[PDB]
Design a protein around this ligand. Structure first.
Ligand code: BX7
Ligand code: BX7
Lengths: 646, 646
C-alpha cells in the first residue's frame, strides 16, 4: 500500500509524524532513490486556488537556512490529488526523540545543550527576521541532523502551517460570543505573539537542561489541569520551576536548577537568569526578543576554560569571553570558588602559571576537562567534592503489565545511567586529584631548591666577609702589632650572630627537606591506597550491568508495542523483569559500597593532607623571608668606613 | 483499496462525510450485505482505555430514538486497529443535500418544513433530556431518511464527538493566557450552552424556510468576516434577517420573511416570533429551552384548514388547534383577511356553510388546497392576488469557467423553477376562482328561488284576503241591501295599496332574474375567455424548458468535478451554455407574456364582476326585506274586529 507523486513515492506503513491535519511519511525520489520527508495534508484544505500555493511556496522557500528543515517542493498526489510537501528528511529524529533516551533522562550533556541552544535561537532569529513568528516551539518539532563533522545540528519545523482550522463550516451558525472568543483569539497577534514563543522556548530549554518539565503537578500536567493552571498563573518573577509533591497540597519553589542537572556551575549561572526573565507572565519584565537574542548570543559566544579547584576537590567550567582579560577571569574563578584573585595560585602541566593583569583569553593555554588549570588558595579551606543527587531505584512493582513494565524499565535504566555518569565523574575528580597532588609536591620541591640556592648564595658572602675581617685584622696586628681591636670585634661578633641564624635556617630547611622525601608524612602514598583506580574497572562493570538493563528495557518497549504476548513470551517477560531487578540492585550496590565509599575516603585523606601541605608551605615561605632578611643585613658590611688618615 | 473489521467492510472511494478528525464511509455488514455508515476516526484518539469505550458506548446506545441516527457498534479496524463507529446509513443524504436542490433554492415546501421542524425539535428534546447538549446544529448534520409511509424523517448526528482536540501536546508549553482563553472557553457550559443551540437552530430554520442565510454581508460570510461580526453583534430584538447589498455600506433590516418565501401567511405568523426570540444575544429575552419547546410543540400540534378569500383572490392556511372553537377560527380568518367574523360568508362544495359559535375543528369539513372553504365578505373589497417576488435571470457571463458555469446553471435552474412554482400557483388561484364563482352564482339563484317562494306564499294570502272582503261585502249588501260601506273600503284600498308594492317587487325580481340567466351581465363567461386554462399546458411547457435547463446544470456539475475537459467536451460545454441561455430566456418570456398577463386580466375582470355581483346581492336582500315587511303587514287583516251586535 503506497502513495506517490510524479517525482516521489512513499509507503503508508512508514510514518514519521502524526497530526490531525496532515501526516509525515518517509518517501523517496524515484529518479534518485533519495530519502525525503513528505507532508501529505489530511484533505480538507482544498478547493483553494493555486496562487496561494505558489506565493506560500515562494515565502517558504525563502526560508532556506540552517536550523530550519529545507523545503524542496509542493506536489500533487497521483490519484487523490491533495497536496504534499517535499522536505528534508531528518533520520535521527527530533529533540523529543533525544530526550527520550535514558542517558538524557536528567538533562542533555553540556556540549549538546549548547548546540541545542545555539541552533534553536538561530532558527528563531532567522524566522522572526522573515516575518514568521513561531507560536509552538517544543522538542516534538525540533528535528536533529548529524553534520559532516559529526556533531548534531537542530532544525525548526512546523511553522508555515499556521492554518486556523479548528474553531469547533460552522461560521454561519455560531453565537456572537464564539465570535467574541475569536476576538479574544486575535488579540494575541498584538504583542502576545513574539513573546509567547519565548515562554515555550523557556520551557523547552528547561526540559532539555533538566530532563523534566519546569511546572509539574500531581502525576502529570494533562492528567491534572485545574492545578496546573494555578501553578503557571501563580509563579512570581525570578522563579524557574515549581514542583508539586504528594497527592495534593501547595508546591515547592526554585529559582535554581535541580541537583540532578549536571550542567556546569558557570553555564548554570548564565542560564538561570535568562530562563527566569523568559518565563514571566506580563509585559515589560518579560524581556523583548532583541535583548533575549543579545543575551543568548553573549552566552553562546564565550569560550570555556576548565579549571580544577584542588582545595574543594571541585571541577569548574569558566565561561570567559574571547577578548576578556585575566582580571575578569580571576573574578569568575573567585565567583565560583570564593577565593579572591590575590589568593589564587595556578598550575598547568606540572608547572606554575602566572597571568598578566590584562592577558586575553585567546592566548590562554588550551585545556580539556582531563587537563585543566589546577587552582588553589594560600589559606585553609574545606573540601566540597561532587554535588550530585542521591537518586534511588524505583520500586519494581511485582505484577504483569506491559505498558507499566516498559515505563518502569525506562525509569530504572535512567537511574542506573545517572549512577554510571556519577561514578565516571568521581573517578575523574580522583584522577585529577592524584595528578595535581603529584605536581604540587614536585612544585614545592622547586621552591625548596630555589630557596637553597639563595641561601648558599648568601652563605658564601658571610663566609668571605668573616674570613676577610679575620685576614685583614690578622695582618694588621701582625705588621703593626698594636692597634680598633675592640671596635671591629663587634662587627665580627654580629656577623657570627648572623651565621648562627643561618645554621638554624639550615636545620629547619633540612627538616622540611626530609618531609618531602618518600617515607615521610607529606608523600603521595595515600593517593595510591585510597580511592578507586582506572584498573579497578568499576565504571565498566556498572556499564555491563547497565547494558543488560538497557537490553531488557528495549525488549519491554517492543513487548509494549505488541500490546499482548504469547505464553512463552510472557514467561520470558517476567523472568527478564526479575532479572532486571537483580541487575539494577547489584549495580546500585556496587555504586554505593565501592564507588562512593572509597571516593569519600580518598577525599577526606586529601583534606587531611592539604592541611599539612599548606602548613609546611607557610613554614617554607617564612624561612625564605628570613633568608632574604639575612641577605639584606649582610649587604651592609661589604663596604664599611675606615678612619680618616693623615 | 478497502478497509474492514470483523463484521464490516468498506471502500475508501465510497466517502460520505469528511472531517479533520474522522471520516464517514458507506460500508456493508459482510454477513448480510446490509448498508451501514462507518465512522473511522482519523487516528490520534488512542492509547486510551477501553472502558471509556464501553461507557460512552452505553450512553450513546441509550440514544436509541427516532430523529437520531442509530448507533449500531464500536469496532476495531482489522490492520490499523483504530476505532470505527457502526451507525445507520441515510442514503438520501442530509438537510444540506436537500437545500442544495434548485427546487428548494427559495426555501423548502411547507409540509417538508413542518417535517423538518418537528423532527429537529424532537431530536433536540430527546438529546437534552439525556444529558447531551448539542452545540453545532446545521443542515450538514441533519440526515434524511424516507419512511415506510413515503414522507421524510430527519435525524440528528455528530453530537457524541465532543472531543476537544484543537487548542492550537502543547499543554505543557502554552502561555498562561492561552489557558485564560481556555477559561474563556469553559464559561460556555454555564448557560451559554443550552441557548447557543437555539441560535444555531434558528439560523438552520431560517435557511430551510427561505433558502438563504439570515445574515449575509458582501459576497459571503466566510469571504467577509469583520463585517459579519458587526452584523451579528449589532442586531436588536424582534429582528430576523439583516442583508448587506452593494459592495459596502450598512445593511437592510427585516423582522419578516423574504418575499420569495412561499410559506403560508399563518405558519409565517407562527414562525416569525419564535425565530426573533431565538436569535437574541443576551440572557433573559433569549427564551429558555422549555418555553421554546412548548411554543414549537404548540405550532406543530395545530391542524391546517385551507380557506380561499374570493374577494382578494388569495389562498390561506389557517393553523387552528384541534380543539379550538369556530370563534377563534373566525378571528384567525379575520386576522389574515381583515374581514370581521359577522362579515364572513363561507362556501363548501357548492353550498353555504354555517359554524356554531362553539364548534370544534376536529369535526370541520376536510379541505385540501384544491377544495377549500371559500370565504367572502358582505362589503366591497379590492382583489390582492398572489404576492410573489419578481426574480430576474442572472446575467450568464460570456466566458469559459467550469466552476462559475456550474454555479451559474444552478442559479438559473433555481430561478426558472421558482417561475414554474409561481405559474402553477397562479393557475390554482384562477381555477379556484372559476369554481368559487360558478358556485356563488348558483348559490345566489337559491336565495332568489327561496325569496320567490316566500313572495308567492304571501301573495296567496293577499289574494284570499281581498277576495274574501269582496265576497263578504257582496253578500252583505246583497242580502241586507243597505249597510260599513265606507269603513271597509279603506281596508280594501290599503290591501290594494299592498298589492301594488307586491307588483313592483315582482318586477324588480324579474329584472334580477334576467341578470342571472346566461346572456346577461352577471354570467360567468369572462372566466372562460380570460385567464389561462389547464388545457393551455403552460405549466408543463415551463416544465419541459426547466427539464432541459436542469439536465444542462447536472452536466455542468459533472464537468466541474472533472476540473478540466477534452477539446470536444469543452466545445459541447459552450454550446450547451448558450443553449441554456436560450431555454431560460424563452421560459421567462413565456412566464411573463402568457402566464402573468392573462392572470392579471382574469384578476381585474374578476374584481369588476365582484362589484356587480355584490351590488345585485344587496338589491336582492333589500327586496327580500320588503317582502318580509309586506308579510308582517298583511298578517294583521287576517282577523279583524266586527261591531258588537245585540
Ligand atoms: O513536523 C511534524 N513532525 C516533526 C517530525 C515528523 N516529521 C519529520 N520527521 C523526520 N524524521 C524522523 C525520524 C525519526 C522519528 C521521527 N519522529 C519524531 O521524532 N517524533 C514524532 C513526534 C514527536 C517526535 C521523525 N524528518 C523530517 C520531518 I518534517 C508534523 C507532524 C504532524 C503534522 S506536522
Ligand atoms: O456526521 C458526519 N456527517 C454527516 C453526513 C456524513 N455521514 C453520514 N452519511 C450518510 N449518508 C449520506 C448519503 C449521501 C450524502 C451524504 N453526505 C451529505 O449529505 N453531506 C456531506 C456534508 C454536508 C452534507 C451522506 N448516512 C449516515 C451518516 I452518520 C461527520 C462528518 C465528519 C465527521 S462526523
Amino acid at each position: 500500500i503506497c502513495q506517490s507523486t510524479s517525482n516521489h513515492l512513499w509507503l503508508l506503513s512508514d510514518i514519521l509524524g502524526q497530526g490531525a491535519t496532515a501526516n509525515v511519511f518517509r518517501g523517496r525520489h524515484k529518479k534518485t532513490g533519495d530519502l525525503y520527508a513528505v507532508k501529505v495534508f489530511n484533505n480538507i484544505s482544498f478547493l483553494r486556488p493555486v496562487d496561494v500555493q505558489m506565493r506560500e511556496f515562494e515565502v517558504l522557500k525563502k526560508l532556506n537556512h540552517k536550523n530550519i528543515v529545507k523545503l524542496f517542493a509542493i506536489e500533487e498526489e497521483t490519484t487523490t490529488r491533495h497536496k504534499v510537501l517535499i522536505m528534508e528528511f531528518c533520520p535521527c529524529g527530533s529533540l523529543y526523540t533525544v530526550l527520550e533516551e535514558p542517558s538524557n533522562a536528567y538533562g542533555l550533556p553540556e556540549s549538546e545543550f549548547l548546540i541545542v541552544l545555539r541552533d534553536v535561537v538561530g532558527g528563531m532569529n532567522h524566522l522572526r527576521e522573515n516575518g514568521i513568528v513561531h507560536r509552538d516551539i517544543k522538542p516534538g518539532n525540533i528535528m536533529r541532523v548529524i553534520g559532516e563533522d559529526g556533531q548534531s545540528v537542530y532544525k525548526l519545523t512546523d511553522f508555515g502551517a499556521a492554518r486556523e482550522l479548528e474553531d469547533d463550516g460552522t461560521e454561519e451558525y455560531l453565537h456572537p460570543d464564539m465570535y467574541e472568543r475569536a476576538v479574544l483569539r486575535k488579540d494575541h497577534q498584538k504583542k502576545y505573539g513574539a513573546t509567547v514563543d519565548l515562554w515555550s522556548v523557556g520551557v523547552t530549554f528547561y526540559h532539555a537542561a533538566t530532563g523534566s518539565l519546569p511546572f509539574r503537578p500531581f502525576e502529570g500536567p494533562r492528567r491534572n489541569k485545574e492545578v496546573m493552571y494555578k501553578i503557571i498563573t501563580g509563579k512570581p518573577s525570578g522563579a524557574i520551576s515549581g514542583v508539586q509533591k504528594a497527592e495534593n497540597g501547595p508546591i515547592d519553589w526554585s529559582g535554581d536548577m535541580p541537583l540532578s542537572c549536571s550542567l556546569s556551575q558557570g553555564l548554570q549561572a548564565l542560564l538561570t537568569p535568562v530562563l527566569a526573565n523568559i518565563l514571566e507572565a506580563d509585559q515589560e519584565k518579560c524581556w523583548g526578543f532583541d535583548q533575549f537574542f543579545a543575551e543568548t548570543s553573549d552566552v553562546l559566544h564565550r569560550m570555556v576554560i576548565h579549571v580544577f579547584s584542588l582545595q574543594h576537590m571541585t571541577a569548574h567550567k569558566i565561561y570567559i569571553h574571547s577578548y576578556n582579560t585575566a582580571a575578569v577571569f580571576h573574578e569568575l574563578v573567585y565567583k565560583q570558588t570564593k577565593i579572591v584573585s590575590s589568593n589564587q595560585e595556578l598550575i598547568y602541566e606540572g608547572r606554575r602559571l602566572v597571568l598578566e593583569l590584562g592577558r586575553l583569553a585567546q592566548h590562554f593555554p588550551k585545556t580539556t576537562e582531563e587537563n585543566p588549570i589546577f587552582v588553589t588558595s594560600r589559606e585553609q579551606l574545606n573540601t566540597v567534592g561532587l554535588r550530585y543527587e542521591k537518586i534511588s531505584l524505583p520500586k519494581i512493582h511485582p505484577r504483569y503489565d506491559l505498558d507499566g513494565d516498559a515505563s518502569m524499565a525506562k525509569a530504572v535504566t535512567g537511574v542506573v545511567c545517572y549512577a554510571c555518569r556519577t561514578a565516571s565523574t568521581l573517578l575523574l575528580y580522583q584522577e585529577l586529584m592524584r595528578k595535581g597532588v603529584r605536581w604540587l609536591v614536585e612544585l614545592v620541591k622547586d621552591d625548596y631548591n630555589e630557596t637553597v640556592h639563595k641561601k648558599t648564595e648568601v652563605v658564601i658572602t658571610l663566609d668571605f666577609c668573616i674570613r676577610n675581617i679575620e685576614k685583614t685584622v690578622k695582618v694588621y696586628e701582625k705588621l703593626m702589632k698594636v692597634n680598633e681591636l675592640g671596635e671591629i670585634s663587634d662587627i665580627h661578633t654580629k656577623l657570627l650572630r648572623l651565621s648562627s641564624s643561618q645554621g638554624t635556617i639550615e636545620s629547619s630547611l633540612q627538616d622540611i627537606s626530609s618531609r618531602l622525601s618518600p617515607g615521610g608524612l607529606l608523600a603521595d602514598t595515600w593517593a595510591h591506597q585510597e580511592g578507586t583506580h582506572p584498573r579497578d574497572r568499576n565504571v565498566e562493570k556498572l556499564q555491563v550491568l547497565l547494558n543488560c538493563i538497557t537490553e531488557i528495557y528495549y525488549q519491554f518497549k517492543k513487548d509494549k508495542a505488541e500490546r499482548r504476548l504469547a505464553y512463552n513470551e510472557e514467561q520470558i517477560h517476567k523472568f527478564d523483569k526479575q532479572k532486571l531487578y537483580y541487575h539494577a540492585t547489584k549495580a546500585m550496590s556496587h555504586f554505593s559500597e565501592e564507588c562512593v565509599r572509597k571516593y569519600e575516603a580518598f577525599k577526606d585523606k586529601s583534606e587531611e593532607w592539604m592541611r599539612k601541605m599548606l602548613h609546611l608551605r607557610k613554614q617554607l615561605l617564612s624561612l625564605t623571608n628570613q633568608c632574604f632578611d639575612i641577605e639584606e643585613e649582610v649587604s651592609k658590611y661589604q663596604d664599611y668606613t675606615n678612619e680618616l688618615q693623615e
